[PDB]
Amino acid sequence: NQPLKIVVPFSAGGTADVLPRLVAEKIRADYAGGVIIENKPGAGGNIGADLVFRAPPDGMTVLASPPGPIAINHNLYQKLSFDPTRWVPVTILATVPNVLVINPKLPVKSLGEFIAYAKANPKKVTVATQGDGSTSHLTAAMFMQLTGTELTVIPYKGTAPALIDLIGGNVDVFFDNISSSATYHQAGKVRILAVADEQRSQILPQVPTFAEQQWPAMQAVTFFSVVAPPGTSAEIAQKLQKQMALALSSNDIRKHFQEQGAVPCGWDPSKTAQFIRQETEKWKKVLKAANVKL
Amino acid sequence: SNQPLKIVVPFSAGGTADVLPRLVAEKIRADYAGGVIIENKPGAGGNIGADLVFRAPPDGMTVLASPPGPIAINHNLYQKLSFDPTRWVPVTILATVPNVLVINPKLPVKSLGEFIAYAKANPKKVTVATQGDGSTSHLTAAMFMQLTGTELTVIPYKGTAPALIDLIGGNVDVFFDNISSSATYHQAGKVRILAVADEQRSQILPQVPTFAEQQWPAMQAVTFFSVVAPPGTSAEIAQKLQKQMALALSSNDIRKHFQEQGAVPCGWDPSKTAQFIRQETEKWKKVLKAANV
Amino acid sequence: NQPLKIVVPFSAGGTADVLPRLVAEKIRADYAGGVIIENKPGAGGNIGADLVFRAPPDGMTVLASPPGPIAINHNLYQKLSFDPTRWVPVTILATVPNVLVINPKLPVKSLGEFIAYAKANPKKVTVATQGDGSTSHLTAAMFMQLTGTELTVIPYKGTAPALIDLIGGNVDVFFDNISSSATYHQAGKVRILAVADEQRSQILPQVPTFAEQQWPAMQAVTFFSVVAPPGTSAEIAQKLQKQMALALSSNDIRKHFQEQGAVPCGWDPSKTAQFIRQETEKWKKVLKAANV
Amino acid sequence: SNQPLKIVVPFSAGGTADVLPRLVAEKIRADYAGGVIIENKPGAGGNIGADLVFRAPPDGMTVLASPPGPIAINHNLYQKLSFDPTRWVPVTILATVPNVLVINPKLPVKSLGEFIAYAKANPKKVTVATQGDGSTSHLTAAMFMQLTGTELTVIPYKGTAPALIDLIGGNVDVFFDNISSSATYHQAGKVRILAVADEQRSQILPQVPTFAEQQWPAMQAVTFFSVVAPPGTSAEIAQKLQKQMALALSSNDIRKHFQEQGAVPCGWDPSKTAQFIRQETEKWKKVLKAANV
Amino acid sequence: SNQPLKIVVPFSAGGTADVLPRLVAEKIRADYAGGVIIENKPGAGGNIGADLVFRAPPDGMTVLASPPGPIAINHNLYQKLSFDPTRWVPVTILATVPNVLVINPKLPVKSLGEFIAYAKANPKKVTVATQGDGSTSHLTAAMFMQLTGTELTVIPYKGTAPALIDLIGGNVDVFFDNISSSATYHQAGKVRILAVADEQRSQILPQVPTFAEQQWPAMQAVTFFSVVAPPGTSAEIAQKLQKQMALALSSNDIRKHFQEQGAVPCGWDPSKTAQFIRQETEKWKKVLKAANV
Amino acid sequence: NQPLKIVVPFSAGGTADVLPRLVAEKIRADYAGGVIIENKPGAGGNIGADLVFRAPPDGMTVLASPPGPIAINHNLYQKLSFDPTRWVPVTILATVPNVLVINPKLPVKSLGEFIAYAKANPKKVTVATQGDGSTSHLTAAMFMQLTGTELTVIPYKGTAPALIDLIGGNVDVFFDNISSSATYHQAGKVRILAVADEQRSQILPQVPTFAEQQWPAMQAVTFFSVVAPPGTSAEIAQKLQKQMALALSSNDIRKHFQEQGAVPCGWDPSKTAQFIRQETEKWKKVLKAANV
């Protein structure tokens, strides 16, 4: 019969695309018609999100996305064609931590010294972002708010131009995801001072968390969710989450996740909904205190 | 006709954009039995007020007195406008006010030449205050960056006051302000004006040299205040109004009140006004393009 | 040597402030101590009115005000600290006319067609106001009572949001003052169909009056009055009116008035007193009927 | 020179502090080929604007026009200032506006004498409104207390408007306001002004007696408006500007406009101006001392 | 114990607010040797009658039976009240009556979903009747707009009756009425009820769906009828009365009579009641803030 | 072995100093190196707080303070060198309640009549404070906000001048702590009408709480906390809390605390952390609404 269709509201290739396709190959065994993955990029995930939001609530069309259209965009975009608060949560596939990365020529050797250095030179230290609302912008804003520091933003079109400047010393700080920066940290081109998560990342087992360094409130991960259209029954959503939780349990899948810097979750629909609710409220505070609404 | 002339200033009352046309209105009231009405119609960088004039009857009884936004910039700056600035019927240029290079005094530089070299040795390390993308201070800083081969990191501010606060405090390094705003802080040692981006020095600060005197004649960045009439206004009607305004601008007391705003009267004829507006439009179009704003 | 004091019971900047300050420049010559103008806004003019109503009736403290505390508010507010029927009238400085403004998409191109259109579609045409008792509401109610038309009232918190909706086609008609709507008419964003005054306004010389379109009774202007405290002698009022009528005669001040959309008047105290009584009874009637 | 004169008023536009210098400015524009600029630089009781002139060149092309705060008060009120008001070069005194004793009408006293007796018979029972320690209404009330040996309980307010609300409403008993602010409420019976703290009566209220008339000549408390120039300004330069402003202050229209603000023009020469400021500085420094104990 | 219980209904006799407590009164008379008085004390949206109970002795012999105005709404709607609803001692919720979305039948939509899409595609073009700011129909309209991100133009009316006349006559487009009022007109085809803002359908019109089952479960807007006691009434006294009323609400005759008003009996205990009132209070406080700027 | 160091960010001799020292003597048996108490006064407790906020987070340096640097000062001072939200809570040692004190000449005998007397005469009743931010100011504002009464604020440089005027009838009410006003209440020089706590104070057993007079939301106590530097493990905080809870359980500690008007608490670190957040948000709201 009918295949399950999973819409990733981003282009193919990245972690946003890799993780749902990995899961798809495992649950293909549960669907007689198969599993279609489609990439529908545009407007921070809002174009692809709208196509699932309007689809029939039978659990045969779902959206697999990082937090944009799930938890952020209704507080970032002045107007949306859909309400993320009406999504039917299915599960959280995984999380990927963000990290504090610095150019090595900054005269600091620790997180604490870097905070003192920024406090003593307000607005003199520059921080790279991917534009207003981007994960790296929001994480820098959370960091600034928690630590009482003021960093001067420099927006970049992509991760690659940001790192080129970070390595060259033309921008001082960057709140990147661990998978992007690890290789440059290992080669000494940049320095990762802390991971904004509850545990360290096995990509860089020696890099400590913010929490180990007296900053447990600094929690900033990119979480990959599966949501169903409004009106999807709790039963249908449970059945799919349990298919995906079983898919996420094998060992090869967990390795392929770790290779993206991602830890599998597979929480039930109730924990998923509570997590999205908490993350939504967290970033709303950050956006408001930073006065960011595009 | 006993119908008053109406002048729309597409910005809030007070400020140079409002002062200069109201000064001129006092004089040309003698030319209008029904008088002269000045209205302030702020909104959207001047576009809201511009649009109200753009759609008015082309009889020369409704004109727009505005700085360059809806005259020569916003159609290259905004995604989409409800009007086309290239179809304005030019009347005259009322005045120009020059922008200047202002630096925080802590910068280890004594001259424009040393500042330029300092910025070159430290790409993106020197910060520049702006009033947002497209504002005169952003466009002036972009022109400077493009001419001199330097890279300054932009910090946008909501108004001029918060930007000067940070400049005096050392939280931002540079600001391309207008001479009138920064003069008092320069005289007090709170900031340092290094160069006026104009053809002549400003009498506000007779000792501050231009960029052109310091090996940079291309750095020319003034705010010009124009009068324009709706599309289809005859050249005869436009020239009659320009001659009235030109006579207004020749009084000595009007020129003093202009100088007190940092402004130099112009009053050029519609042909030279149209040519100036085309030159400035293309100048800033190239600057916006190179900066990709 | 004591200066004349003129209290304007409204904030600085608007026409209520401009016109008495223009007259003040001219009559400073009759007062060795000068002329003070104070703005005392609050409660639709009532706060400032109360301050003058309690002042000594020697002619050295006057209220210059639009109609609210002069002719309307005692029939609008449930209680006032002053009685507008005891004001000692000095003069009417000027009038500014109200106008009939429509969204341009209404399938009507004249006053006559608009009245007919509303007749054939009772309650289908909506009219913006600024609350009950506001000038746009009273003028709308008068229009309905004279033409026997039925308009559905949509209230707004101010003129700016009303005009936004009128221009956007979310409300159909608005009875504005001429100086507010003129620029939007010239821009084609609205259409003024008629001026509720005896003569056309020189701001929009081609816009006809109600009177020349067979509705002379539709007379709705904001008048700017000067009044003195209770018990001010008739002679003291006459003397002040003469000073102000002389101030209103120069060309320059009359032109500055027209720039506000205002025609200078300067009527003597007897004609001013009769005018205010007529206006007072007119708006009382309009209120009663609209409130039914 | 073609450089304009700059007058900094270290307060917001629109009040008496701004109105009086602006009136003088228009009259002396004829003396300056470059015109006269007036800027409003508010902040910190006048010290922000004051500092900007104190640091400007002492050529007489930048001067401060201000009420007494940064001229005679604030170095004895604030802990640390960036400038020493005793080093100002005085130019002239533009005008004075007197402060007055205003009471709630329900107080069972009809005259200043009866009020002073009433406060004596009920120490600390009569409450007095202020705008905070150091404000004119506070210093004037403290002078009154020290002179008459009375004790009033001090209730501070954020500004004049809420103080007057409470005075009219009987929530505070007394207020030492300036005559211009309270006159309309006195005329309406909402308050009663008992005495003007000046050498002569105010023509706004010709029937209100002075403290002097009622055997208290020492109660002299006016807001005086000064023009001062930066340290190092020559006596000759200060004299030249004072003579220009004296001529402006002698005209009859200036007189009337000043009176409409409750102000009387002065225009004293720089030597009398300096002596007046020294005396007021000592007076208010003495009052601040006794008050803080 | 020989004193009658007194129930004050702060509205006029005749309506649901009067019917439901009077039905309950007939059953609980068995518990009061002196009987049960019901008084109607209308005025100021319930605040006059509420004040009379709020000030009564907290012995449980005087209670207020009221819809939400003076229980959960008015202290966030009126600028000031003589009493604080958050200090009421809750007893029980007697019943809920749901509000519904009612449209003129000429609107080119046949379902809630089509209506929402139509409004979003024509912002401010669809008009909505209310009974003034703060009225139940206005608050329910504002909640609908905030949840759905739609914009409706508000037309206020003096009461329900003129609103329905205009709705039926096509002079206003939508009205958020209570089910009991619109049902007959829906059945006659003079209006179309599209959805009920409640957890379950109303038996008045079993075929009309809820917002919830059409994917809008957050659209929950009912008129709830509460019994509250004066501040300081012991929890025990409140429990005793709630238990008496819950027993009355379980009788078959009373439930039927409640359904005839469009009301569902509740009878919750004082703790669940207090929770619901807090939730509803916060709910409408948010709607009021987001609505009035 | 290294002593435990307790920094009290206020001068010796007051209740803030007495209570931690009493506890220290009881926990000296748990520390082979002893227990040091230091007084580091200055800037409302901020100077001494800063010295602990920067100390090694090993449980050997702790701050024992009233609420200023624990829950208030970041919402009151423009900038602090530390962030109170990052303190690692240990325990609440004790609370001391504030009370409503009036001059005996007010024509009221109860809290009820006082609230009514002020409602009927807004702004006529005056209230003494120690300046904006002081506990007497914050408690007065909370009262005003909860009861919708309006009192006119008279500030004083300290408690003693305020009591002089309260007794003298130059100010009408004062929200003092129980220990300061009790003696004057017993002498009839003031009248305490209500204690802003959950239970009555044994210093004045006959004086009722706000809560038993139908105002339980009126809870205003000075609480004395122990906090550890940021990053102090929860285990270290728990060990210290358990030591202080034992010290707080002795009857002789109860008595010495009561003699200060204090009741021992000794709650675990989780309840302590919850309490501090509740009090922080409480007084943040009071400040906001007060400054408007």
Numbering used by the authors:
A (entry chain A): 21 to 314
B (entry chain B), D (entry chain F), E (entry chain D): 20 to 312
C (entry chain E), F (entry chain C): 21 to 312
Please give the exact wording used by the authors of the publication that reports this structure.
In order to understand the open structure of TphC, we sought to crystalise TphC alone. A Crystal structure of TphC is shown in ribbon representation (α-helices red, β-strands green), the structure is comprised of two domains with a large solvent accessible cleft located at the domain interface. Residues (P28-D37, PFSAGGTAD) map to the motif [P∗-F-X-A-G∗-G∗-X-X-D∗] which is highly conserved in TTT-SBPs (conserved residues underlined). Superposition of the open and closed TphC structures highlights an ~36° closure between the two domains upon TPA binding. Overlaying the open and closed TphC structures indicates the movement of the upper domain (α4–α6). TphC shows a 36.3° closure angle, whereas previously resolved apo- and ligand-bound structures of Bug27 reported a closure angle of 24.7°51 and other periplasmic binding proteins show closure angles ranging from 15° to 60°58.
In this study, we characterised the TphC SBP that is a key component in the cellular uptake of TPA, the breakdown product of PET plastic. TphC belongs to the TTT family in Commamonas sp. strain E6 and through biochemical and structural analysis, the ligand-binding properties and 3D structure were determined in both open and ligand-bound closed forms. As with the tripartite ATP-independent periplasmic (TRAP) class of SBP-dependent transporters, they are symporter proteins driven by an electrochemical ion-gradient, rather than ATP as per the SBP-dependent class of ABC transporters. Here, we report the biochemical and structural characterisation of TphC in both open and TPA-bound closed conformations. This analysis demonstrates the narrow ligand specificity of TphC towards aromatic para-substituted dicarboxylates, such as TPA and closely related analogues.
